[PDB]
Amino acid sequence: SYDIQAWKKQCEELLNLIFQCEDSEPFRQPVDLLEYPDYRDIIDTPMDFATVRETLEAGNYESPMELCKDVRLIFSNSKAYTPSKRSRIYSMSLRLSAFFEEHISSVLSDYKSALRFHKRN
Ligand SMILES: CC1(C)CO[C@@H](CNC(=O)N2CCN(C(=O)c3cccc(O)c3)CC2)CO1
Numbered sequence: 001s002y003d004i005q006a007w008k009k010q011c012e013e014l015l016n017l018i019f020q021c022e023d024s025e026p027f028r029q030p031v032d033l034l035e036y037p038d039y040r041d042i043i044d045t046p047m048d049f050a051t052v053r054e055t056l057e058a059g060n061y062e063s064p065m066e067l068c069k070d071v072r073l074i075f076s077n078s079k080a081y082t083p084s085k086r087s088r089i090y091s092m093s094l095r096l097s098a099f100f101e102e103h104i105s106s107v108l109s110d111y112k113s114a115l116r117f118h119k120r121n
Helices: 007-020 022-027 049-057 064-081 088-118
Strands: none
Touching (some): 007 049, 007 064, 022 088, 049 064
16 A cells, blocks of 8 residues: 555554553553652653553654654663563563564555655656
């Protein structure tokens, strides 16, 4: 497909699948802080899947690369705060990241192909 706009609904559907994954439970809403009062002493830019979905629906992503950067930020934040590899949260982040990356690859490739087609002549 050379549809330049198709990534948005593809990302909406992928976020729906991520919300149905039990493994997204730790990452659905902005970090509390009452449970992690030193979170901002480690994490510069909090990110969660609800914030990514609201940013998409507001029309405040221009490309799927920008959405992908924020989703990758969720997993880097979780790694930056994980006190060890043998943490349930860390194992949840790795599985959900693998699922995300498996599904976002086509969405990025199709978008970049469509833009190249748009500027072909
Ligand atoms: C001592 C405690 C209270 C520690 O917390 C429980 C296990 N969970 C974590 O350690 N997390 C830190 C890592 N996370 C995040 O960076 C994150 C990312 C996006 C949104 C979001 O809301 C958090 C998730 C939660 C177990 O008991």
